Amino acid sequence: GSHMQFIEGKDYQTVASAQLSTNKDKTPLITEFFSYGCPWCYKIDAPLNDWATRMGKGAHLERVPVVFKPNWDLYAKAYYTAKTLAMSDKMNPILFKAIQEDKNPLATKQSMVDFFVAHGVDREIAKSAFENSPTIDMRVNSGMSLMAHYQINAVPAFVVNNKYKTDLQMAGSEERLFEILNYLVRKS
């Protein structure tokens, strides 16, 4: 009578499951591969946060920054640092705006340190994060390895419950993207 209308191969695809250690208070898990440097990541970020808020316990959104372009390595470190400080909800829109709207590339370690300090972060925490943290470097790399495992080569992209992927290109619009994500969080 009625037929499924979330179409595998068009709206989403299945991926090979990665070997994960996911905390169950992070389930259903939505992983967004993104960068501050991506205009499409920027466009959808605030609606995505709103959608995530409206999902409440129905979803746990985790972001994974990617390195595709000059300066994106530092943008990734900025994400990990802000997250560590529990400041990524505050800093995500600030960083997006600086890079995308003010065309401030924040292209040096120094410029990033200063930017973080201007927004209330301790100078040494930010300096040491950018200049001497193998821990943060390893997270940047591990995010990129994950992205490759999922056969993702464009952002924004989403992997839901370590099994289904979608992106704005597949969805075709922000509204369809969130309909797709609402569907996927419930699968398998």
PDB file of C-alpha atoms in Angstrom:
ATOM      1  CA  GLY A   1       0.000   0.000   0.000  1.00  0.00           C
ATOM      2  CA  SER A   2       2.419   2.610   1.327  1.00  0.00           C
ATOM      3  CA  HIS A   3       6.042   2.027   0.622  1.00  0.00           C
ATOM      4  CA  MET A   4       9.269   2.989   2.401  1.00  0.00           C
ATOM      5  CA  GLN A   5      10.241   6.517   1.437  1.00  0.00           C
ATOM      6  CA  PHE A   6      13.791   6.781   3.091  1.00  0.00           C
ATOM      7  CA  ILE A   7      15.586   5.282   0.107  1.00  0.00           C
ATOM      8  CA  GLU A   8      18.835   3.316   0.660  1.00  0.00           C
ATOM      9  CA  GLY A   9      21.401   4.466  -1.883  1.00  0.00           C
ATOM     10  CA  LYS A  10      19.775   7.873  -2.301  1.00  0.00           C
ATOM     11  CA  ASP A  11      18.959   9.292   1.116  1.00  0.00           C
ATOM     12  CA  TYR A  12      21.559   7.235   3.004  1.00  0.00           C
ATOM     13  CA  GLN A  13      23.996   4.398   2.705  1.00  0.00           C
ATOM     14  CA  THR A  14      25.126   1.602   5.006  1.00  0.00           C
ATOM     15  CA  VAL A  15      28.809   1.618   6.017  1.00  0.00           C
ATOM     16  CA  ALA A  16      31.151  -0.949   7.477  1.00  0.00           C
ATOM     17  CA  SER A  17      31.095  -0.756  11.286  1.00  0.00           C
ATOM     18  CA  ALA A  18      34.172   0.658  12.923  1.00  0.00           C
ATOM     19  CA  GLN A  19      35.713  -0.802  16.039  1.00  0.00           C
ATOM     20  CA  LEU A  20      34.417   1.571  18.657  1.00  0.00           C
ATOM     21  CA  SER A  21      34.348   2.053  22.352  1.00  0.00           C
ATOM     22  CA  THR A  22      31.124   4.117  22.572  1.00  0.00           C
ATOM     23  CA  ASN A  23      29.821   5.048  26.089  1.00  0.00           C
ATOM     24  CA  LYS A  24      26.056   4.078  26.067  1.00  0.00           C
ATOM     25  CA  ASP A  25      25.066   7.553  27.376  1.00  0.00           C
ATOM     26  CA  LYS A  26      26.355   8.535  23.879  1.00  0.00           C
ATOM     27  CA  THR A  27      23.700   6.224  22.120  1.00  0.00           C
ATOM     28  CA  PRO A  28      22.062   6.699  19.533  1.00  0.00           C
ATOM     29  CA  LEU A  29      25.223   8.149  18.267  1.00  0.00           C
ATOM     30  CA  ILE A  30      25.464  10.691  15.460  1.00  0.00           C
ATOM     31  CA  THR A  31      28.957  11.492  14.301  1.00  0.00           C
ATOM     32  CA  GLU A  32      29.281  14.662  12.158  1.00  0.00           C
ATOM     33  CA  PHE A  33      32.501  15.002  10.107  1.00  0.00           C
ATOM     34  CA  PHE A  34      32.956  18.746   9.722  1.00  0.00           C
ATOM     35  CA  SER A  35      35.288  21.671   9.703  1.00  0.00           C
ATOM     36  CA  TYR A  36      35.068  25.312  10.771  1.00  0.00           C
ATOM     37  CA  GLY A  37      36.564  25.884   7.388  1.00  0.00           C
ATOM     38  CA  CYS A  38      33.576  24.456   5.422  1.00  0.00           C
ATOM     39  CA  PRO A  39      30.828  26.791   4.387  1.00  0.00           C
ATOM     40  CA  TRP A  40      28.236  24.017   4.302  1.00  0.00           C
ATOM     41  CA  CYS A  41      29.201  22.791   7.803  1.00  0.00           C
ATOM     42  CA  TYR A  42      28.690  26.404   8.807  1.00  0.00           C
ATOM     43  CA  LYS A  43      25.324  26.755   7.185  1.00  0.00           C
ATOM     44  CA  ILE A  44      23.849  23.751   8.909  1.00  0.00           C
ATOM     45  CA  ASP A  45      25.547  24.052  12.288  1.00  0.00           C
ATOM     46  CA  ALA A  46      22.979  26.079  14.203  1.00  0.00           C
ATOM     47  CA  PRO A  47      19.924  24.189  12.836  1.00  0.00           C
ATOM     48  CA  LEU A  48      21.791  21.013  13.654  1.00  0.00           C
ATOM     49  CA  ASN A  49      22.328  22.188  17.242  1.00  0.00           C
ATOM     50  CA  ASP A  50      18.688  23.135  17.473  1.00  0.00           C
ATOM     51  CA  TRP A  51      17.653  19.755  16.095  1.00  0.00           C
ATOM     52  CA  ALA A  52      19.961  17.982  18.487  1.00  0.00           C
ATOM     53  CA  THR A  53      18.484  19.950  21.424  1.00  0.00           C
ATOM     54  CA  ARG A  54      14.955  19.111  20.288  1.00  0.00           C
ATOM     55  CA  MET A  55      16.091  15.403  20.045  1.00  0.00           C
ATOM     56  CA  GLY A  56      17.199  15.499  23.681  1.00  0.00           C
ATOM     57  CA  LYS A  57      17.877  11.870  24.714  1.00  0.00           C
ATOM     58  CA  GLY A  58      16.775  10.594  21.278  1.00  0.00           C
ATOM     59  CA  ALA A  59      20.365  11.329  20.024  1.00  0.00           C
ATOM     60  CA  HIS A  60      23.962  12.141  21.089  1.00  0.00           C
ATOM     61  CA  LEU A  61      25.794  14.320  18.562  1.00  0.00           C
ATOM     62  CA  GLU A  62      29.574  14.113  18.395  1.00  0.00           C
ATOM     63  CA  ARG A  63      31.665  16.124  15.988  1.00  0.00           C
ATOM     64  CA  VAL A  64      34.844  15.008  14.218  1.00  0.00           C
ATOM     65  CA  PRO A  65      36.863  17.707  12.544  1.00  0.00           C
ATOM     66  CA  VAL A  66      38.585  16.860   9.238  1.00  0.00           C
ATOM     67  CA  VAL A  67      41.687  18.126   7.547  1.00  0.00           C
ATOM     68  CA  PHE A  68      41.178  18.754   3.806  1.00  0.00           C
ATOM     69  CA  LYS A  69      42.731  22.233   3.329  1.00  0.00           C
ATOM     70  CA  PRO A  70      45.345  24.643   4.560  1.00  0.00           C
ATOM     71  CA  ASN A  71      44.503  25.736   8.106  1.00  0.00           C
ATOM     72  CA  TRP A  72      42.043  22.890   8.757  1.00  0.00           C
ATOM     73  CA  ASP A  73      44.619  21.103  10.974  1.00  0.00           C
ATOM     74  CA  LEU A  74      44.543  24.041  13.380  1.00  0.00           C
ATOM     75  CA  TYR A  75      40.759  24.309  13.060  1.00  0.00           C
ATOM     76  CA  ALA A  76      40.641  20.644  14.214  1.00  0.00           C
ATOM     77  CA  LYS A  77      42.815  21.302  17.167  1.00  0.00           C
ATOM     78  CA  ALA A  78      40.619  24.245  18.079  1.00  0.00           C
ATOM     79  CA  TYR A  79      37.561  21.936  18.129  1.00  0.00           C
ATOM     80  CA  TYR A  80      39.332  19.358  20.377  1.00  0.00           C
ATOM     81  CA  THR A  81      40.572  22.002  22.716  1.00  0.00           C
ATOM     82  CA  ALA A  82      37.171  23.695  23.099  1.00  0.00           C
ATOM     83  CA  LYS A  83      35.559  20.266  23.622  1.00  0.00           C
ATOM     84  CA  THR A  84      38.046  19.326  26.308  1.00  0.00           C
ATOM     85  CA  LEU A  85      37.115  22.614  28.143  1.00  0.00           C
ATOM     86  CA  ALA A  86      33.426  21.852  27.761  1.00  0.00           C
ATOM     87  CA  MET A  87      33.183  25.029  25.721  1.00  0.00           C
ATOM     88  CA  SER A  88      32.394  23.719  22.238  1.00  0.00           C
ATOM     89  CA  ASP A  89      28.688  24.827  22.335  1.00  0.00           C
ATOM     90  CA  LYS A  90      29.896  28.403  23.023  1.00  0.00           C
ATOM     91  CA  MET A  91      32.950  28.280  20.742  1.00  0.00           C
ATOM     92  CA  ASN A  92      31.591  26.493  17.680  1.00  0.00           C
ATOM     93  CA  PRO A  93      29.488  29.474  16.466  1.00  0.00           C
ATOM     94  CA  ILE A  94      32.200  31.974  17.424  1.00  0.00           C
ATOM     95  CA  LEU A  95      34.852  30.072  15.435  1.00  0.00           C
ATOM     96  CA  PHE A  96      32.516  29.536  12.456  1.00  0.00           C
ATOM     97  CA  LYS A  97      31.718  33.232  12.347  1.00  0.00           C
ATOM     98  CA  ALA A  98      35.321  34.407  12.559  1.00  0.00           C
ATOM     99  CA  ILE A  99      36.508  32.095   9.835  1.00  0.00           C
ATOM    100  CA  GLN A 100      33.445  32.203   7.525  1.00  0.00           C
ATOM    101  CA  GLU A 101      31.936  35.715   8.020  1.00  0.00           C
ATOM    102  CA  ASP A 102      34.851  37.837   9.182  1.00  0.00           C
ATOM    103  CA  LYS A 103      37.216  36.001   6.791  1.00  0.00           C
ATOM    104  CA  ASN A 104      39.719  35.787   9.647  1.00  0.00           C
ATOM    105  CA  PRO A 105      41.582  32.682   8.708  1.00  0.00           C
ATOM    106  CA  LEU A 106      43.033  32.147  12.241  1.00  0.00           C
ATOM    107  CA  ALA A 107      45.896  30.599  10.306  1.00  0.00           C
ATOM    108  CA  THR A 108      48.577  30.599  12.886  1.00  0.00           C
ATOM    109  CA  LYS A 109      49.021  28.943  16.262  1.00  0.00           C
ATOM    110  CA  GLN A 110      49.429  32.475  17.719  1.00  0.00           C
ATOM    111  CA  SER A 111      46.261  33.872  16.221  1.00  0.00           C
ATOM    112  CA  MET A 112      44.372  30.867  17.612  1.00  0.00           C
ATOM    113  CA  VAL A 113      45.824  31.212  21.088  1.00  0.00           C
ATOM    114  CA  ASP A 114      44.910  34.904  21.149  1.00  0.00           C
ATOM    115  CA  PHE A 115      41.394  34.106  19.896  1.00  0.00           C
ATOM    116  CA  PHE A 116      40.819  31.493  22.599  1.00  0.00           C
ATOM    117  CA  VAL A 117      42.168  33.833  25.300  1.00  0.00           C
ATOM    118  CA  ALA A 118      39.808  36.616  24.074  1.00  0.00           C
ATOM    119  CA  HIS A 119      36.965  34.207  24.635  1.00  0.00           C
ATOM    120  CA  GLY A 120      37.969  33.325  28.191  1.00  0.00           C
ATOM    121  CA  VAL A 121      40.362  30.343  27.837  1.00  0.00           C
ATOM    122  CA  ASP A 122      43.565  30.246  29.914  1.00  0.00           C
ATOM    123  CA  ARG A 123      46.454  31.254  27.762  1.00  0.00           C
ATOM    124  CA  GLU A 124      48.696  28.314  28.713  1.00  0.00           C
ATOM    125  CA  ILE A 125      45.999  25.730  28.153  1.00  0.00           C
ATOM    126  CA  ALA A 126      45.468  27.093  24.637  1.00  0.00           C
ATOM    127  CA  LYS A 127      49.175  27.571  23.872  1.00  0.00           C
ATOM    128  CA  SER A 128      50.187  24.104  25.050  1.00  0.00           C
ATOM    129  CA  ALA A 129      47.230  22.569  23.190  1.00  0.00           C
ATOM    130  CA  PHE A 130      48.405  24.043  19.892  1.00  0.00           C
ATOM    131  CA  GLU A 131      52.158  23.818  20.363  1.00  0.00           C
ATOM    132  CA  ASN A 132      52.754  20.675  22.388  1.00  0.00           C
ATOM    133  CA  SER A 133      49.968  18.156  22.629  1.00  0.00           C
ATOM    134  CA  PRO A 134      50.639  14.764  20.990  1.00  0.00           C
ATOM    135  CA  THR A 135      47.290  13.786  22.595  1.00  0.00           C
ATOM    136  CA  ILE A 136      45.377  16.352  20.514  1.00  0.00           C
ATOM    137  CA  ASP A 137      47.481  15.456  17.434  1.00  0.00           C
ATOM    138  CA  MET A 138      46.553  11.819  17.859  1.00  0.00           C
ATOM    139  CA  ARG A 139      42.812  12.750  17.995  1.00  0.00           C
ATOM    140  CA  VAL A 140      43.068  14.761  14.813  1.00  0.00           C
ATOM    141  CA  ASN A 141      44.590  11.679  13.083  1.00  0.00           C
ATOM    142  CA  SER A 142      42.200   9.161  14.643  1.00  0.00           C
ATOM    143  CA  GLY A 143      39.240  11.280  13.386  1.00  0.00           C
ATOM    144  CA  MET A 144      40.715  11.204   9.890  1.00  0.00           C
ATOM    145  CA  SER A 145      41.277   7.448  10.075  1.00  0.00           C
ATOM    146  CA  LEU A 146      37.633   7.031  11.070  1.00  0.00           C
ATOM    147  CA  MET A 147      36.446   9.161   8.205  1.00  0.00           C
ATOM    148  CA  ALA A 148      38.402   7.016   5.776  1.00  0.00           C
ATOM    149  CA  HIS A 149      37.057   3.773   7.318  1.00  0.00           C
ATOM    150  CA  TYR A 150      33.528   5.065   6.525  1.00  0.00           C
ATOM    151  CA  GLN A 151      34.554   5.981   2.943  1.00  0.00           C
ATOM    152  CA  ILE A 152      33.740   9.592   3.524  1.00  0.00           C
ATOM    153  CA  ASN A 153      35.498  12.205   1.396  1.00  0.00           C
ATOM    154  CA  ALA A 154      33.183  15.205   1.786  1.00  0.00           C
ATOM    155  CA  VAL A 155      31.727  17.236   4.634  1.00  0.00           C
ATOM    156  CA  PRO A 156      29.426  17.827   6.290  1.00  0.00           C
ATOM    157  CA  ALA A 157      28.773  14.115   6.603  1.00  0.00           C
ATOM    158  CA  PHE A 158      26.979  12.051   9.224  1.00  0.00           C
ATOM    159  CA  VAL A 159      27.360   8.500  10.476  1.00  0.00           C
ATOM    160  CA  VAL A 160      24.607   7.286  12.639  1.00  0.00           C
ATOM    161  CA  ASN A 161      24.935   4.351  15.106  1.00  0.00           C
ATOM    162  CA  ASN A 162      28.229   3.266  13.442  1.00  0.00           C
ATOM    163  CA  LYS A 163      26.168   1.884  10.524  1.00  0.00           C
ATOM    164  CA  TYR A 164      24.409   4.429   8.315  1.00  0.00           C
ATOM    165  CA  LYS A 165      25.766   7.475   6.554  1.00  0.00           C
ATOM    166  CA  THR A 166      24.194  10.508   4.959  1.00  0.00           C
ATOM    167  CA  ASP A 167      25.241  14.056   3.979  1.00  0.00           C
ATOM    168  CA  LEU A 168      23.751  17.251   2.674  1.00  0.00           C
ATOM    169  CA  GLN A 169      24.400  16.268  -0.860  1.00  0.00           C
ATOM    170  CA  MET A 170      22.371  13.057  -0.475  1.00  0.00           C
ATOM    171  CA  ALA A 171      19.657  14.758   1.491  1.00  0.00           C
ATOM    172  CA  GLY A 172      19.493  17.664  -0.966  1.00  0.00           C
ATOM    173  CA  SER A 173      18.171  20.114   1.674  1.00  0.00           C
ATOM    174  CA  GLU A 174      18.592  20.860   5.363  1.00  0.00           C
ATOM    175  CA  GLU A 175      15.050  19.880   6.073  1.00  0.00           C
ATOM    176  CA  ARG A 176      15.361  16.451   4.367  1.00  0.00           C
ATOM    177  CA  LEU A 177      18.723  15.918   6.069  1.00  0.00           C
ATOM    178  CA  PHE A 178      17.146  16.181   9.535  1.00  0.00           C
ATOM    179  CA  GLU A 179      14.233  13.953   8.501  1.00  0.00           C
ATOM    180  CA  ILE A 180      16.847  11.408   7.421  1.00  0.00           C
ATOM    181  CA  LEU A 181      18.798  11.684  10.643  1.00  0.00           C
ATOM    182  CA  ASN A 182      15.557  11.338  12.734  1.00  0.00           C
ATOM    183  CA  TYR A 183      14.916   8.077  10.808  1.00  0.00           C
ATOM    184  CA  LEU A 184      18.433   6.693  11.038  1.00  0.00           C
ATOM    185  CA  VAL A 185      18.878   7.198  14.801  1.00  0.00           C
ATOM    186  CA  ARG A 186      16.197   4.646  15.263  1.00  0.00           C
ATOM    187  CA  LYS A 187      17.718   2.010  12.902  1.00  0.00           C
ATOM    188  CA  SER A 188      19.506  -1.163  13.955  1.00  0.00           C
TER     189      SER A 188
END
